[PDB]
From a paper:
In addition to Cys83, we also mutated the other Cys residue in the [name] NTD, Cys54, in case it formed a disulfide as well even though the residue was disordered in the structure. The two structures adopt the same coiled-coil dimer as the wild-type [name] NTD, confirming that [name] NTD dimer formation does not require the Cys83 disulfide. The individual protomers of these two mutant dimers also show differences, similar to those observed for the wild-type dimer. Interestingly, residues 53–70 from one of the protomers in the structure at 2.6 Å resolution are stabilized by crystal packing, showing strong electron density corresponding to an α-helix. These N-terminal residues are disordered in the other two structures. The Kd values for the wild-type and [name]/[name] NTD dimers are 0.18 and 0.05 μM, respectively.
[name], [name], was originally discovered as a protein involved in Fas-mediated apoptosis and later in regulation of expression of several genes, including oncogenes. Biochemical studies revealed that the interacting N-terminal regions of [name] and [name] form a docking platform that recruits the HCC to the U7 snRNP. Our crystallographic studies of [name] NTD demonstrate that residues 71–137 adopt a continuous and stable α-helical fold and mediate the formation of a coiled-coil dimer between two [name] molecules.
Residue numbers in the entry:
A (entry chain B): 70 to 138
B (entry chain A): 71 to 144
Write the structure that this text describes.
């Protein structure tokens, strides 16, 4: 049978564990937020790069063909 | 606080910590997927920049050569 003081002791231990666990949760939530932002910007970066690259290669191929013609 | 009130608060703290641990593992799995996906996107971008540069540079030199060939014959 848990005593009144034992419940007070365990409650304090639980708050210390809870504070420690809440710190780790906010940390991994912070990491989640930056990882998602990095994910979305990398997709926007690789998309603009593909468009920039194909546009410039086409334009260069048009010069080469006209010069040959 | 009464003895039963203490049992309740203690039990409630335990249950909040279990709920918190569950959400932690959920988010951790998300971050593992995002780290994996971001690393590959960064390798894609490096590969694509390299190959586009090779193409553009090669195109620039063919354009240069064709202009110099023309002038040399005019």
């Amino acid at each position: 049978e848990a005593t009144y003081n034992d419940l007070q002791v365990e409650y304090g231990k639980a708050q210390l564990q809870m504070k420690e666990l809440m710190k780790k949760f906010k940390e991994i939530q912070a990491q989640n937020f930056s990882l998602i932002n990095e994910n979305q910007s990398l997709k926007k970066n690789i998309s603009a790069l593909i468009k920039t690259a194909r546009v410039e290669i086409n334009r260069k191929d048009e010069e080469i063909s006209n010069l040959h013609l």
